[PDB]
Amino acid sequence: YEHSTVMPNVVGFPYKAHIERPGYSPLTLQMQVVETSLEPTLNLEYITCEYKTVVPSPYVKCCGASECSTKEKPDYQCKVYTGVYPFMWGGAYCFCDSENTQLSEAYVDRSDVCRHDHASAYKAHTASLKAKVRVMYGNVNQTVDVYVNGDHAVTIGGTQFIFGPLSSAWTPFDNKIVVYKDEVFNQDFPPYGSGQPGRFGDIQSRTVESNDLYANTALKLARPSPGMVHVPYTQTPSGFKYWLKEKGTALNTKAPFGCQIKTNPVRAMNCAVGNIPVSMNLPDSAFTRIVEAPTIIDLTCTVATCTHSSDFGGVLTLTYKTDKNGDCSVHSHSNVATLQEATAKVKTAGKVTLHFSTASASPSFVVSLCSARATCSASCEPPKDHIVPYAASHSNVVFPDMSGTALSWVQKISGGLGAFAIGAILVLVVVTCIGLRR
Amino acid sequence: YEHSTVMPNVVGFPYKAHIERPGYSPLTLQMQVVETSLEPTLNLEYITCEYKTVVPSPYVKCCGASECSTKEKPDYQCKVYTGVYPFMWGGAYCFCDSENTQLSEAYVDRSDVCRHDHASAYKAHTASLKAKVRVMYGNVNQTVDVYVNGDHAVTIGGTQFIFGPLSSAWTPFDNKIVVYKDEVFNQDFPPYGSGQPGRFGDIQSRTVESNDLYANTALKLARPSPGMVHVPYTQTPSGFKYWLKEKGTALNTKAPFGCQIKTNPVRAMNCAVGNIPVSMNLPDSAFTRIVEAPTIIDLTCTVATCTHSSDFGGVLTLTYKTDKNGDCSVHSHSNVATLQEATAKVKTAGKVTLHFSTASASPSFVVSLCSARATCSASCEPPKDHIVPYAASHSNVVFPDMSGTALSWVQKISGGLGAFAIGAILVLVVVTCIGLRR
Amino acid sequence: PVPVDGMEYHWGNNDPVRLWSQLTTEGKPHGWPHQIVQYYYGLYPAATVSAVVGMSLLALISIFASCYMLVAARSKCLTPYALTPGAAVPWTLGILCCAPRAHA
Ligand SMILES: *[C@@H]1O[C@H](CO)[C@@H](O[C@@H]2O[C@H](CO)[C@@H](O[C@@H]3O[C@H](CO)[C@@H](O)[C@H](O)[C@@H]3O)[C@H](O)[C@H]2NC(C)=O)[C@H](O)[C@H]1NC(C)=O
Ligand SMILES: *[C@@H]1O[C@H](CO)[C@@H](O[C@@H]2O[C@H](CO)[C@@H](O[C@@H]3O[C@H](CO)[C@@H](O)[C@H](O)[C@@H]3O)[C@H](O)[C@H]2NC(C)=O)[C@H](O)[C@H]1NC(C)=O
Ligand SMILES: *[C@@H]1O[C@H](CO)[C@@H](O[C@@H]2O[C@H](CO)[C@@H](O[C@@H]3O[C@H](CO)[C@@H](O)[C@H](O)[C@@H]3O)[C@H](O)[C@H]2NC(C)=O)[C@H](O)[C@H]1NC(C)=O
Ligand SMILES: *[C@@H]1O[C@H](CO)[C@@H](O[C@@H]2O[C@H](CO)[C@@H](O[C@@H]3O[C@H](CO)[C@@H](O)[C@H](O)[C@@H]3O)[C@H](O)[C@H]2NC(C)=O)[C@H](O)[C@H]1NC(C)=O
């Protein structure tokens, strides 16, 4: 028996579905979203880590000269100085007074610990959803892991469930993403090969294991002091440490809809938005023949107390007359009130009680017990507590019933005004007809 | 000196760009697309391969009875039969004449060679383009590899190049893809957990090494024939073997724009569509001072022969007067004609020759040698060879010049008719003025 | 078929071979007007006919409008002489031909 329904994507909300086969007694399902997960698709751009400056020992050529030689090294800088007269601890070598030469050399290379502390640069697109739904009905109670897209069917006790695609296509990750340890940032990083010194991406590598490297830190050499051997240099500090201190904010403490951002892999969990359609296919053994189920007649609904709070703050009672005792499946056909239980045990005493939660001052909903039916209405008082630590258990609908007190007052006033207008219209029509007949 | 241009995405096309700095002699670059690669992003769905039926030996429990036991095996089937009287080569055992039972067992399992011969089901979206471009200017050769998107800068001899995103967003891959060895099929495969026997995907596995398996091949047992021990069964043939014989066509022999599909990784190569914007940044060392370049005056252009063929079927002659001999940059400012050379040897003799290819009956364009300008017009006859094995070297522009023979005839007839109409208007106006002045 | 775009074929185990068409025809350009039409009908034989028909129709419309305007101008100029018992002014008769050749 094929069926379809739409259920909200709110964690912990006890959704109940009603199935009414013409030949069998009605059945009530309970589906609950225990946990979700939003998986984006990532493309690695490059890897940035702190650099380390390699400076070899100078080569002081006594009584001669040397020539610079170009090399293929990241940010290689080499210069040659003349007229140097170095010293050492025991004396001064390079006997030649002024015909000496020093060759200075320096370049940049990736640090030793880059494979432990590095920040990635990704591009994120086409998020994919994943869920974990608990399904219970009759004597069946299981939890399954389902991809939320209409191409994965899971079997629970002989029943086939297909969870349709999410209603909306909203994702919290921008087109560009920077990931560091367990934090995600919505940042726009410089393109590869065009990084600027002193900021994020001063040195870039295509992958942590990649051999090539692009470095730009404006490493510049200076002439050594007289009578010294030290190879002076100046360099703009690493951009990674500037970024590590001035990254600013995050996505863990900034994501909308109250969903946590986690890493390895990058995902956003328990993030309430949209609706998840559900398609079903039930066997004929789940239902019960209507001859076996009890027959319920003369159903009347009365409400004891009502209070539109977050928890189940309503007490509701049914009176009936039955021939045999058994089990029915209760359900509310309007989302103004949400029942707590999906099965009430019917006895010949003819009195059962139910709990419900509502969020409107005066609700009106129709409830069914087995095949019976009845209309419920009540007056509810506000709650006193200002703040509670649990989520709302109702559908959050506020507009009251047309038979409520406020709308009854409005109806009476409008009826009086309409009667006055009708009387005036009738008087005018009679007068003008009399005038026309003359 | 920043510059920008757009180049066709046609492999082998000799694109030439002209840079006109106002303090230096003009420069001409050559860019050629050697190889491209359209790379889609893939998500694995499931893996299908030929199945194998495992049928254990029967357990003939006799002078007693046996009960079937359920197991968690893919497509498991078990039954117990009563009244068997088996026979063997030496005789018949199980003394009890009719009080014997046989237990049959069978199930499905993944084949032995599934990890060398299997078909993959993918989801493809958001293709990424990659290219390899050859650039030459002055004396600098070299080819580079570039990601075709606005976030990769490559330096070639001191010049920074950024290749912008493709103009079009067309991909030959549909949403769903089935990959087999080196063939790609645009196919709509059934969802996981809902495979039908006898067709593609009768058995599915989430990954080649995954333990889980969903098999639906309608395995059914039958009662053994009297006096034998054989465990009969029937089963729908494998769906993978069927798919191998009637998959139909492919994408290698079906893709548009004449681009070959390859596998591992899935990509589409040399696939001509759209335009590639180019952003450039050149240093001052590439240009030449205007004082060093020779001065060219009195530039005239003449055409010897012209045949609008695919190859360079045009000969052009330039006459000039110079003071010294050197090198100029030769360029054509209209796409109706494409020159073969980008630089020419200028001499005091005053005659140079060039080669161009056109696709219009009467081309007209302006050609510059260093800083001089000249206008060329030609009459071209159609070629005689019907079919050639090489691509066209022109821009495929057919509309002739306004000074062409056909347009000249149109101009003459239109002018005659306009003169007649103007005379009509003048006569009518004269008559009307005479009538009004009366 | 081998259009101007080109095509390839794959025969046996050999590598695919590509062939491209070329702009060839049977007309003669740079000649009489009745030969340029043939040359541009060999190429694109669906727009040349439409362009020729459009140009001819426009020329016919223009020439008909001009001839009608001359006729209307002559009729407007000559009709005052018909409302009086006057002459024809043979100076105007020579330039403007009218229905009365010599009789009034
Ligand atoms: C021992 O000490 C003596 C000090 O005189 C060293 O003699 C020096 O040898 C170098 C060898 O290159 C000479 O340099 C050359 O000088 C000429 C002329 O100035 C120049 O054209 C060359 O390009 C090169 O620079 C240097 O002039 C010379 N000193 C003098 C002549 O006063 C000697 O080399 C030392 N022995 C060693 C280091 O084994
Ligand atoms: C349907 O099956 C699920 C399990 O598949 C049942 O979940 C059960 O939920 C209750 C309360 O939510 C769990 O009891 C809790 O145990 C912890 C243990 O530390 C205790 O601290 C709590 O105070 C509470 O008593 C119970 O463990 C859990 N069953 C499991 C995990 O197997 C669910 O109750 C079933 N449906 C019905 C209607 O019973
Ligand atoms: C050696 O051969 C004799 C042949 O008589 C086997 O005796 C058979 O034993 C089985 C096992 O108990 C008997 O089956 C029983 O049948 C009764 C109904 O008569 C039923 O109520 C029991 O639940 C059980 O199924 C069988 O009747 C009996 N044969 C005869 C003729 O009575 C004996 O088991 C063999 N020895 C061994 C070690 O197998
Ligand atoms: C920039 O470098 C490329 C690659 O080195 C140069 O292209 C190469 O040009 C030479 C001729 O100058 C080609 O050699 C000849 O190729 C023909 C092809 O049929 C062959 O039959 C001859 O025996 C001879 O080997 C060479 O093949 C060609 N390379 C490629 C990959 O096509 C290019 O000329 C250089 N740029 C400039 C401005 O020279």
Author numbering:
A (entry chain H), B (entry chain A): 1 to 438
C (entry chain B): 319 to 422
Describing publication, verbatim:
The mature alphavirus virion is approximately 70 nanometers in diameter and has T = 4 icosahedral symmetry. Trimers of E1-E2 heterodimers are organized into 80 trimeric spikes on the virion surface. The LBD is comprised of eight cysteine-rich complement-type repeats, also known as LA domains (LA1 to LA8), which contribute to binding with SFV.
To elucidate the precise mechanism of SFV-VLDLR recognition, the single LA repeats (LA2-Fc, LA3-Fc, or LA5-Fc) in complex with the native SFV virion and SFV virion alone were firstly reconstructed by cryo-EM. To increase the resolution, a block-based reconstruction algorithm was applied, which improved the resolutions of SFV virion, SFV-LA3-Fc, and SFV-LA5-Fc to 3.02 Å, 3.45 Å, and 3.55 Å, respectively. In the structure of LA3-SFV, LA3 binds to the DIII domain of each E1 protein at both the 5’ and 2’ symmetry axis regions. It is worth noting that LA5 was also observed to bind to E1-DIII at the 5’ and 2’ symmetry axis regions in the structure of LA5-SFV. However, in the twofold symmetry axis region, LA5 only binds to 2/3 of the E1-DIIIs. In the case of LA5, residues E197, D213, D215, D217, H196, P207, and W210, which correspond to the residues at the binding interface of LA3, sustain interactions with E1’s K347, K345, N325, E292, D327, and G326. However, the sites in LA5 that correspond to LA3’s Q126 and R114 are occupied by S204 and G194, whose side chains are too short to form hydrogen bonds with K347 and E292 of E1, resulting in a weaker binding affinity compared to LA3. LA5 can also independently bind to site-1 to -3 and site-1’ to -3’, but when LA5 binds to site-2 (or 2’), it creates steric hindrance with the LA5 binding at site-1 (or 1’) and site-3 (or 3’).
